[model samples]
Target: AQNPNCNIMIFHPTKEEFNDFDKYIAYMESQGAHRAGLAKIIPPKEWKARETYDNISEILIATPLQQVASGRAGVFTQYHKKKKAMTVGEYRHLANSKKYQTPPHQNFEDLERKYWKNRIYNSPIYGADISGSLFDENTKQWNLGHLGTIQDLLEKECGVVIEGVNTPYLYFGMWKTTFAWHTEDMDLYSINYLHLGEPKTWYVVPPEHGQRLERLARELFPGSSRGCGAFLRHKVALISPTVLKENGIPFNRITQEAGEFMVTFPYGYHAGFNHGFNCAEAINFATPRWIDYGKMASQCSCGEARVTFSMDAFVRILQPERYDLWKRGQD
Candidate 1:
């Protein structure tokens, strides 16, 4: 059962109200939403992605975990030796048919409590880009390319549409498929839209209790901590909410229904899994306040040759325009 304290805010927004992302944040922030570090918004209708399209021959593979341990990297039970020949149509058929049915003895609560204990039965498809292929250009105002708002400050100033970051990345999920706890790179805010599918559950830790969660994670995974300070960024490690409650860490469990929007804060830590076969799209965005958080975001969980968008560049672009605003010690 979900405790009252564990409930994150959910908004039922009208089309007019949902049009502006900044206004959504304004209303949510005014209601003390940042404390939860995440929120869900149910819009009037589905702002969906293209369900079918051409040039869908390629499909990315997912090494769905057989088992994940806080102490070590996840155990992969299934590995394809060669490049798998699969198409989007085949993958979709496979995912959609694998509907998870609850066991007669175990209830939803029991299943949820032991989510990590179960074997990952589904092969989730992740990091599938839909920019030109499936992305609905008509809904770009809200999906990832929305301009004319404070949330658009970075993109508008930078004049770049960064794929997979500012642009949308789609995910196909089924039972026991999971994403581990991690803050967004560069501490940017992220929003996931469940364009269509069954409910997906999220476990989030607010920024205030992030350090405590990190400490608990470190204690649980000493080996990981020894490997890297941002071992959580390795994207493995799934801890039960029951353990979180036992350790007195402030966290919220959110069940994001289909056709709803889920947003995570700049430095908020989040991890979740899908209840059944589902398709969702997510992208990262920024607020002016992200500069403060991004500045403190020293390492990118260890970067490589290909670099991400620059925080410094965004800051420099923010100058001259907001120079007088900064003089007032404000946004």
Candidate 2:
């Protein structure tokens, strides 16, 4: 199972699932949010080639808000808590040894506890829950479904689930000020689904064309809402590999009614804004596969010493004790 490229697959909900936000809410509450489990990633043969499009393939699902930066060398802050940042070299060395080393003036366990507690308690967004675990190198495979239980719900709601497929889809919502601006390398078909509430704005442009857009943004719309306005123009050049945006054909500007259509592609460059006091939902998913265990270490920096072992690793080490918490045929 390979990770599908950036794209959208939209479908109407079944009568039973229509307007059934309650079921969604109930399920999310039952299974912690951030615990959305490991994605099956088939890493490139050589680690250095991981970033290339060709060398990497397989079912990999990344949470929306999580991101990683790249440089020959740079600091890596704890994933959950913004503790003092450490150089990548230091982190690699420490993690490689499987040893916990504390920095000066820092208590590792204390930091871990704080991050874990706050993740569960400090969500400004409604019904946000976060929990994560890690796996050691010895593990052979991990079940993807164990991450969370949304599959049955999705199949129940929509006869089919098609978010990550090479299909075009529409997403509607008022822009939330906190939304981030990024592009999907996969072809994605979408509709902004905007309305008047908090006065949302958009700046659409190519991903690599960010520099010019930045300059234009500052010059045309200084301090525009959320650093986005300047790029939203009818005449800007479209980025490459995007036949739709590159061709100056209005790519279906829509709201509510238009929401009832389906388009296909797996990657595209798009960004959104939210009107103040807005409500919206997205239709999205990835091609399913098993879990990725090696990547778990990256987030371990947050729990630090509070949780004595890495999420996956700890599970294996604590498997005996955990069995008491699991029922037959249950996680």
Candidate 3:
């Protein structure tokens, strides 16, 4: 029943219900990540004060990357070449220093508008890690709510680690900062939480229709690979929902608000732009069902799959007691 074209659901679980991590995972497992859903766990009031851009800025400025400008902003044009990078510290300086002074008649919104219209959006070269940040601290209120526990347990108990597969990634985006359409590597599930700022609009095409979408893209952009790197290239074209619908492929659209979470199912093709300046955190995780797809992704030529652990490795590490439990359940 878990097809590529399954519908997506948006649900809000009560604070009390979300507090029970075991039950929450069970419910999500029952729904199946193949038919992904968005879970808004933290309400606006609870996350309001915590969503400031300064929080992420400070953390990013403290972290460093090589051959990358810390934080840089430039003009936004669809499919244009990437703007030059700057350090996070430099970006903050431009934002607050007297050199880029706010005009007497203009307010913050006016300044932001100019940033989007005249300048490129700034984001962390390599997003900060959320493990020790305020985002991590706040998320713990939901008790193992981050959803990486299963993957972490696999690494700890079986000494298996997957690169870029099960770790959290932070993002600081402004208006016109876009992530092109692509599915998660190996069809893993991903959850993005908007910590603060303006909402992000997302467009999604279910897994079953993913290939059709790719073929359509190839038809539109002749000789394109329609693979992961195709969208990552500079000046790459974005496939809009309008184009998809005109092609007879239905897609879902949602404006993810502040303090909300957006979950993408395995192999779901999704793309979106930031409404304005916003800070968010995201991470990938796996359930038992992800095992088979994970193997297939590892063997694929997408070049995005950097397999951290194989299914065979995981199976070998299964404890006898847990294996018996699984066997009994199957019966």
Top model number, TM-score: 1
- How do the predictions measure up, each by TM-score? 0.73, 0.22, 0.63
State each candidate's clash count.
Answer: 0, 33, 14
Give candidate 1's TM-score: 0.73
lDDT of each: 0.61, 0.25, 0.51
TM-score of 3: 0.63
lDDT of 2 at 181: 31
**For this target, which candidate reaches the highest lDDT against the unseen true structure?**
1
Two-way lDDT contest, 1 vs 2, winner: 1
Q: What is the C-alpha RMSD of each candidate to the true structure, in Å?
A: 7.6, 22.4, 9.4
Candidate 1, position 2, lDDT: 28
**TM-score order of candidates, best first?**
1, 3, 2
Which stretches of model 1 miss by more than 4 angstroms?
1-7, 45-85, 96-110, 120-135, 147-165, 298-331
Give the Å error, residue 50, model 3: 4.8
lDDT of 3: 0.51
* TM match of model 2 to true structure: 0.22
